[PDB]
Write a protein that binds this ligand. Structure first.
Ligand SMILES: CCCCCCC[C@H](C)CCC[C@H](C)CCC[C@@H](C)CCC[C@H](C)CCC[C@H](C)CCCOP(=O)(O)O
Ligand SMILES: *[C@@H]1O[C@H](CO)[C@@H](O)[C@H](O)[C@H]1NC(C)=O
Ligand SMILES: NCC(=O)NCC(=O)NCC(=O)O
Ligand SMILES: O=S(=O)([O-])CC[NH2+]C1CCCCC1
Ligand SMILES: O=S(=O)([O-])CC[NH2+]C1CCCCC1
Ligand SMILES: O=S(=O)([O-])CC[NH2+]C1CCCCC1
Ligand SMILES: CCCCCCCCCCCC
Ligand SMILES: CCCCCCCCCCCC
Lengths: 277, 96
């Protein structure tokens, strides 16, 4: 059961002197933190988002993030090529940690530039991305050579602070992250597959955790044509799934949607396709 | 690397006429993050929407969840409209 925490940053320079920034913290796919640029502070999205850290550790982290953003803007100006050609551009930073089954922490700090890998932080050095070229090497040279504790602070943050906080988060959020939410299901007609054909859609909405089983059935026979859509997020942390089946007109009768979920405790949801009295 | 937004529109609950519901629009796989996502009622933008903070996947493409609480009626058509630099025209996906 690998679990992960990511701090992500997105910032776009529209031109040489104007940039937008955005940042958030994610426990797996659950957003746990936002960032308020206009005070440079963490937005704790849940009661438990402090995840066992003291106010002192968290404000230290805030100060760290602010020093980081300050250094980032100062350096981006002093080493920007400044020609309008290189604008607009967008940087993405994904930093954080993944805790493996046995407890082994793995840190990461990856950066993309215009949606392409730019560089990551492996062991103790900034590795430029292979597919990228001289921008990657320039940034890595700056980070490996012309800085102080920047590299070592990143190391401790992603290798020690982050797994500690990740675990604190899971623990403080145990009643949320371990909850069960019963889905509801309903049937609809989807986009016509063709003349004389129907698209049966079984919507399953509002389940958590994410593992769900949905099939179109004829009694106990699973219909082979069933397609599962993407498991899509709902607001307030549940999931949504469409299971669809194209069938001939005249072969729809008898088909049912069957939904299994950990929250249903054996009592599968069964909905029979109707469409005509 | 410029990827175009995928738009999926879905309700939280079965469409019951006169019953409160949530319209979701999940927009994913786009790059760059500059984007205009609006939920529409009868082709008019809905102000009372919520959206997730910008996030992105392993391939660095972005995704946003939008949602608005609404009450569907027979006469009301709802949609999700996305404008993006990769789009020649705003893409509008209607809800069933
Ligand atoms: C304007 C945009 C700003 C975006 C800033 C993003 C900040 C996030 C949203 C704050 C909430 C995150 C949450 C409180 C995480 C807890 C903090 C710890 C546990 C995570 C540490 C590991 C982290 C993933 C690395 C982030 C490193 C940072 C981006 C670079 C700092 C190094 O620079 P410096 O030389 O100043 O030390
Ligand atoms: C830079 O872009 C910002 C935001 O779009 C704008 O306010 C500013 O005037 C621009 N500067 C230029 C085009 O030199
Ligand atoms: N931001 C779109 C998205 O994927 N949100 C995920 C989410 O809200 N997850 C809640 C959970 O995993 O419990
Ligand atoms: O509110 S806001 O003006 O979008 C915050 C932008 N600050 C970031 C953008 C420039 C790169 C590093 C920091
Ligand atoms: O392991 S996982 O549940 O798929 C993590 C997904 N989180 C996404 C948002 C935060 C940054 C990483 C991509
Ligand atoms: O079942 S699942 O929703 O795919 C697991 C994703 N992580 C969840 C549990 C711990 C962090 C909050 C979200
Ligand atoms: C706080 C340290 C931030 C260092 C990152 C600077 C990136 C500058 C890019 C210049 C390209 C040549
Ligand atoms: C055109 C300049 C590209 C700037 C890329 C900045 C990468 C920031 C890495 C931050 C690590 C501390």
């Amino acid at each position: 059961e690998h679990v992960s925490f990511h701090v992500i940053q997105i910032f776009s320079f529209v031109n040489q002197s104007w940039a937008r920034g955005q940042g958030s913290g994610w426990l797996d796919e659950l957003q746990t933190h936002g960032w308020d640029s206009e005070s440079g502070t963490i937005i704790f999205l849940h009661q438990w988002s402090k995840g066992q850290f003291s106010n002192e550790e968290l404000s230290d982290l805030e100060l760290l993030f602010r020093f980081y953003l300050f250094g980032l803007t100062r350096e981006i100006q002093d080493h920007a090529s400044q020609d309008y050609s290189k604008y607009p551009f967008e940087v993405q930073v994904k930093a954080g940690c993944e805790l493996h089954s046995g407890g082994s922490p793995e840190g990461f700090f990856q950066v993309a530039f215009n949606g392409l890998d730019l560089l990551s932080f492996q062991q103790t050095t900034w590795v430029p991305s292979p597919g990228c070229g001289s921008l990657a090497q320039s940034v890595c040279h700056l980070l490996n050579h012309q800085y102080e504790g920047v590299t070592e602070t990143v190391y401790n943050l992603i290798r020690s602070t982050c797994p500690r906080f990740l675990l604190g988060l899971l623990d403080a959020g145990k009643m949320y992250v371990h909850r069960q939410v019963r889905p509801e299901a309903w049937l609809s007609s989807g986009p016509s597959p063709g003349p004389g054909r129907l698209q049966l859609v079984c919507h399953v909405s509002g389940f958590y955790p994410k593992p769900v089983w949905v099939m179109w059935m004829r009694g106990e026979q699973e219909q082979q044509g069933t397609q599962l859509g993407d498991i899509l997020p709902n607001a307030n942390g549940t999931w949504y799934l469409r299971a669809t089946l194209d069938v001939a007109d005249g072969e729809a009768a008898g088909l049912s949607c069957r939904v299994k979920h950990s929250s249903l405790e054996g009592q599968d949801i069964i909905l029979y396709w109707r469409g005509s009295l | 690397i410029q990827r175009t937004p995928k738009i999926q529109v879905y309700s939280r609950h079965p469409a019951e006429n006169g019953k409160s519901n949530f319209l979701n629009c999940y927009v994913s796989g786009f790059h760059p993050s500059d984007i205009e996502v609006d939920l529409l009622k009868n082709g008019e933008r809905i102000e009372k929407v919520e959206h997730s903070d910008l996030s992105f996947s392993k391939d660095w493409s972005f995704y946003l969840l939008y949602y608005t609480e609404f009450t569907p009626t027979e006469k009301d058509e709802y949609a999700c409209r996305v404008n993006h630099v990769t789009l020649s025209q705003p893409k509008i996906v209607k809800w069933d």
